[PDB]
Amino acid sequence: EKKVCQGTSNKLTQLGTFEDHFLSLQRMFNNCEVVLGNLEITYVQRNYDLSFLKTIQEVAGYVLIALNTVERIPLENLQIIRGNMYYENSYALAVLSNYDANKTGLKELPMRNLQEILHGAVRFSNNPALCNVESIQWRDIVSSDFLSNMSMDFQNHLGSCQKCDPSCPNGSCWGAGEENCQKLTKIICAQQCSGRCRGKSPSDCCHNQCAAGCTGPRESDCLVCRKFRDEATCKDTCPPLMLYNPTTYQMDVNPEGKYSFGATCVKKCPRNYVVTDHGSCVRACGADSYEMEEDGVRKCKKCEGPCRKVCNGIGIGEFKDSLSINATNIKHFKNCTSISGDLHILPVAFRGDSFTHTPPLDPQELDILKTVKEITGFLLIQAWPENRTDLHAFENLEIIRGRTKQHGQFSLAVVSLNITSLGLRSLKEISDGDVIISGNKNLCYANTINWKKLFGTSGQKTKIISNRGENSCKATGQVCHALCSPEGCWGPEPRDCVSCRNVSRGRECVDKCNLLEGEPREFVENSECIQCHPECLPQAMNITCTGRGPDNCIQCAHYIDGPHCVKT
């Protein structure tokens, strides 16, 4: 069903030893077909197997095979390389210096089903022993737009390599056995259609949106799509809901029209993405917009007036290459309410950077993060000063939409901290993503949150383990709270219960708001007793204020204007 494979963005980085990086590569790419990220094959030794790479069908980024030792990388069922992310700003398929001191590295790279690369180019460098790759022509694979910047070399010296397959045209074979040659689809083909084809017949070529060949002129018999992926077909633009009608001259329901969520076309956008008027599920709307829901689902409309400021956040826009918030970029978050991006609090901001020449982050500037209210993407907090006990910098954090997720799964990750309470006093809804709280030393109040009523999207777990222990916060310094529900509490202070049973006045919860022995008299309204009209005299052992308004009292304070209790 084309299971989602997340991919790796850790280019040329050895994760621990060679065995640990190989186990991480086997654990990351196990039984996944479509890779939305990047296929990075680095540091694979000689005596290991790469059978888990047989199931990868397509990659939506660059394919970086670099610094390896194994003689065979079975990327056999890899069909198309999209190349959405560039390695050296124009390159997608980069095989770079796979050789040991014996100069016997990657002997063969059987990419059998690879027929087309849309974006990016091909770079081959420093391959002493490499069979049946130098005979592959790349005019069939790489399109005519990105043909100028590509360059490669081949130096076969004492490799003891055998002959290619003579039963295939132009001598281009990927391997050495039978039917192991290149299924070329471009040059032995008529120019009577701008798409691909399957043979030399003029009237038997593929659809315009069928990339990497097809098995018929119909769009259903098609291997992969080019821009949008309809259900078992390939289209350029799947139609919107309401089209024209030649009979009633009004809007008509969709015969086959759906929305547009990325590469695929789904019937309904998720509850956090913005539904535009053109029928495409988007993360962020236009630059002159106003994100506000109209009828249930989230939409964006054309803003009027000043249209002051929107925050791109970390990862997209101007701050794409910056990896954490620090003392340089925090001044752009002063008058900011909605984070349309990500927030990374990493320990690089507190230790200082000598490479990018940035000063360390002042811990008093995190109160600027008091100003923001919501996060569309994810939150990754891996750093906090040792003196402050609670994460009070995100007190007004209302909703985390989870549009962008860390490794495609997680949305809230407060890990490796020195806090004793979370203190997220306004976190009421997480629209998408997984929540992990792990690696902390002295953080209890985590198993008493009951996250199942926090998120609404089904199919989401949580990961809370090895934080404090249940027998560690048993002492008198740490308790959830009394008098409130055991649904959730964020800290030891009484303003931290999620659902207070009796009294829910403001952000705090008390014994009772006194209707008999208190000078402020607060009427109960939706289990949240708030202060009534200030010009109402408190009674003696009676109900003083009934509701919101001056017309809900018995005896007025100063003057009586009909039912109203007026000051003058």
């Binding site: 959405n84 992310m85 008529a190 120019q191 009577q192 259609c193 701008s194 017949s201 003029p202 009237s203 038997d204 315009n208 002129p217 821009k227 350029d236 633009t237 919107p240 024209y244 001259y249 009004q250 809007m251 547009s260 969520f261 990325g262 590469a263 993405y273 535009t276 008027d277 053109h278 495409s280 599920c281 988007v282 993360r283 962020a284 709307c285 236009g286 409309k301 054309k302 997209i316 549009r403």
Partner: protein, 563 residues
């Protein structure tokens, strides 16, 4: 090179003397016809040199009741047939017939998308039955309706022997049809010859010249900049990397069966980049301060807006009667058209349809914009002008009477027009015929009213010059360059002097006169009357009485009041 096409199904022309003149003003220079290529009631000695470049017809092609010897449509390339004459017909040659059609001479016609052929009742035509219509038709309509007349009543020569197959339209050697579908090999839709190499692109429609897609003879779905394909480039690019939306700089606006840089006037643009005549529901026509308009999404209720004829509320009715006069209550912009049939002023028994009154047209006083045509064929003898439409500013003409006209006057008792504030006729033409009392017909600046090169006045059978010189039917000298509407001085469209209450006057009463008026750049307006008249000086400057150098009785710091 874009014209809108007429809508004359089978009816008689309103004026036979200006019908060929109508076809000359419209169909000249056209290559892409958005509507219908209709040739109805053309007599002999008709200069049809305006038909030698029409290639694309989006609707049907009708040749009806004509007495010409030949119709020069040799450059007719594709007939799309978005609008069909009958239910399943796209090429209808009917009742033509010394007169009658001799030869059709449809050389380049080799593609009909939707519809069939009805050649019937033409006893002068030879080669209507020897045409292989399966070569022209598309694969979807291969079971089309191919009704061909059999009786010819004239024995003529066979085809030219230079080409085989006996598939000719006429008697010339360069006239016989080249097969584009029944000569192909394999699964080729269109091809030049029998070789599989010479097959055409799948988005070519009426053949090609080479195997590429940028050199089709006619294109199947959408053309832009010489490149034609199925999907037109929209204005919204959906980036699937960070899941965002971008304005496309290379996106073109969908116009008919093509994609243009910016589609012209009287074509309302939408958010999807597909401009057309009318906008759908929950959309308001707003002005983009550039001469063109582009409707977008409206507010939340969007309840009431003025509609008219040819719309959702009025479909079957053709005239404005007392039953649909309450719906035009004080609206300044009629969505639709207005038509005053002679049956609208007639009382029909057993129907409860009361005839109109001259005092009932005063609800049309605040009208400023008509999105359709203005058709008037009956007028009472109460007032001889159109002072009930004196505030009408612009006629858009997106809906046309018979597809050709937007200001039609048929047999009235009108003597002068009186359309004072009429400043822009959008589309269509202006037909005036059989008005035996209308003198002021050539004094109107029709060239200043036009916005397209295919627009011209068609006037005939009006009051001649000899009944307008001795009778004194000539207005004042205040109307500049002869641009005059009626004999009164209040109906100059552009006079070189000032304006006193929508009336051109010679000199303002600033230095003289019993009241005092202040001078505008183009107007001349009366201010407060209690300002003191200055005997030989500039008296008044603004509407508030504080800007006088002297006033009448009392001097207060805000202004001068009588009490």
């Amino acid at each position: 090179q874009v014209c809108t096409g007429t809508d004359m199904k089978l009816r008689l022309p309103a004026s036979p003397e200006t019908h060929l003149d109508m076809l000359r003003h419209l169909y000249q220079g056209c290559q892409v016809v958005q509507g219908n290529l209709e040739l109805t009631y053309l007599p002999t000695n008709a200069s049809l040199s305006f038909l030698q470049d029409i290639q694309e017809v989006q609707g049907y092609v009708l040749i009806a009741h004509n007495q010409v010897r030949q119709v020069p449509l040799q450059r007719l390339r594709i007939v799309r047939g978005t609008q069909l004459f009958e239910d399943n017909y796209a090429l209808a040659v009917l009742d033509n017939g010394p007169g009658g059609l001799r030869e059709l001479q449809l050389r380049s016609l080799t593609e009909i998308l939707k519809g069939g052929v009805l050649i019937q009742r033409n006893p002068q035509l030879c080669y209507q039955d020897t045409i292989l219509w399966k070569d022209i038709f598309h694969k979807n309509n291969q079971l089309a309706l191919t009704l061909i007349d059999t009786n010819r009543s004239r024995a003529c020569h066979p085809c030219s022997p230079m080409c085989k197959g006996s598939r000719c339209w006429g008697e010339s050697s360069e006239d016989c049809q080249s097969l584009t579908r029944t000569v192909c090999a394999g699964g080729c839709a269109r091809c030049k010859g029998p070789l599989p190499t010479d097959c055409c692109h799948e988005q070519c429609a009426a053949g090609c010249t080479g195997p590429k897609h940028s050199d089709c003879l006619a294109c199947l779905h959408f053309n832009h900049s010489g490149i034609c394909e199925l999907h037109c480039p929209a204005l919204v690019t959906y980036n699937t990397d960070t899941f965002e939306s971008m304005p496309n700089p290379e996106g073109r606006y969908t116009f008919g069966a093509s994609c243009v840089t910016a589609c012209p006037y009287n074509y309302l643009s939408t958010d999807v980049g597909s401009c057309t005549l009318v906008c759908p529901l929950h959309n308001q026509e707003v002005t983009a301060e550039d001469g063109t308009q582009r409707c977008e999404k409206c507010s939340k209720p969007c309840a009431r807006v003025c509609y008219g004829l040819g719309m959702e509320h009025l479909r079957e009715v053709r005239a404005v009667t007392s039953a649909n006069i309450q719906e035009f209550a004080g609206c300044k912009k009629i969505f639709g058209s207005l038509a005053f049939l002679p049956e609208s002023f007639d009382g029909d028994p057993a129907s409860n349809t009361a005839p109109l009154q001259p005092e009932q047209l005063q609800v049309f006083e605040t009208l400023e914009e008509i999105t359709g045509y203005l058709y008037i064929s009956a007028w009472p003898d109460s007032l001889p002008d159109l002072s009930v439409f004196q505030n009408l500013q612009v006629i858009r003409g997106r809906i046309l009477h018979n597809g050709a006209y937007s200001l039609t006057l048929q047999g009235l008792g009108i003597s002068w027009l009186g359309l004072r504030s009429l400043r822009e006729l959008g589309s269509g033409l202006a037909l005036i015929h059989h008005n035996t009392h209308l003198c002021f017909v050539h004094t109107v600046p029709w060239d200043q009213l036009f916005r397209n090169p295919h627009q011209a006045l068609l006037h005939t059978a009006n009051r001649p010059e000899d009944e307008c010189v001795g009778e004194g039917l000539a207005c004042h000298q205040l109307c500049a360059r002869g641009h005059c509407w009626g004999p009164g001085p209040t109906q100059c469209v552009n006079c070189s002097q000032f304006l006193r209450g929508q009336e051109c006057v010679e000199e303002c009463r600033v230095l003289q006169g019993l009241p005092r008026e202040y001078v505008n750049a183009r107007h001349c307006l009366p201010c407060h009357p209690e300002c003191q008249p200055q005997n030989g000086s500039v008296t008044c400057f603004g509407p508030e009485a504080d800007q006088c150098v002297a006033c009448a009785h009392y001097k207060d710091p805000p202004f001068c009041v009588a009490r």
